[PDB]
Amino acid sequence: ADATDDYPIPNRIMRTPCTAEQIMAAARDVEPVYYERYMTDYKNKPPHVQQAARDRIHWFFSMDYAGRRQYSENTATDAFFEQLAWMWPNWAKLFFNNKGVAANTTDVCEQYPPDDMSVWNWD
Ligand SMILES: [Br-]
Ligand SMILES: [Br-]
Ligand SMILES: [Br-]
Ligand SMILES: [Br-]
Ligand SMILES: [Br-]
Ligand SMILES: [Br-]
């Protein structure tokens, strides 16, 4: 109905200066089960859904705290705000699912390369 500091989007994810690919590389090292779960889901999706999730997460991490917080608010007040969720509800599960994974990944994501797109290739 209303967003908290950590629901539906972790505070650390709304504040991180990292790219999606920095968070994903951090996850591959410090939250490997979460990374592999996400990539198993992702690889079962059609190419147009894969591309839509990459575009939308790049859009999210392009915003400052204000923009990210407004998106969190909009998805909390309306579970159907995000059109991508009509196709793939867990399109951002690696990024948004819980604050424990968020703390571990955002703690180290800055040390990884911002543009390493190989995090999107798995098997
Ligand atoms: Br929470
Ligand atoms: Br987009
Ligand atoms: Br913004
Ligand atoms: Br928005
Ligand atoms: Br799903
Ligand atoms: Br999620």
Author numbering: 32 to 154
Sentences from the paper on this structure:
To acquire iron from the host, M. tuberculosis uses the siderophores called mycobactins and carboxymycobactins. Rv0455c homologs are highly conserved in mycobacteria (>65% similarity) and are encoded by genes classified as mycobacterial core genes.
To this end, the crystal was soaked with sodium bromide, and the phases were determined by multiwave anomalous dispersion (MAD) using the bromide ions as the source of anomalous scattering. In addition, we found that other evolutionarily conserved amino acids clustered predominantly in two distinct surface-exposed patches: the interface between the flexible N-terminus and helix 5 (patch 1), and the interfacial region of helices 2, 3, 7, and 8, (patch 2). However, the lack of chemical shift perturbations by NMR spectroscopy indicated that the close Rv0455c homolog MSMEG_3494 does not interact with carboxymycobactin. This finding is consistent with the absence of a deep cleft in the crystal structure of MSMEG_3494 and in the identical structure of Rv0455c predicted by AlphaFold36.
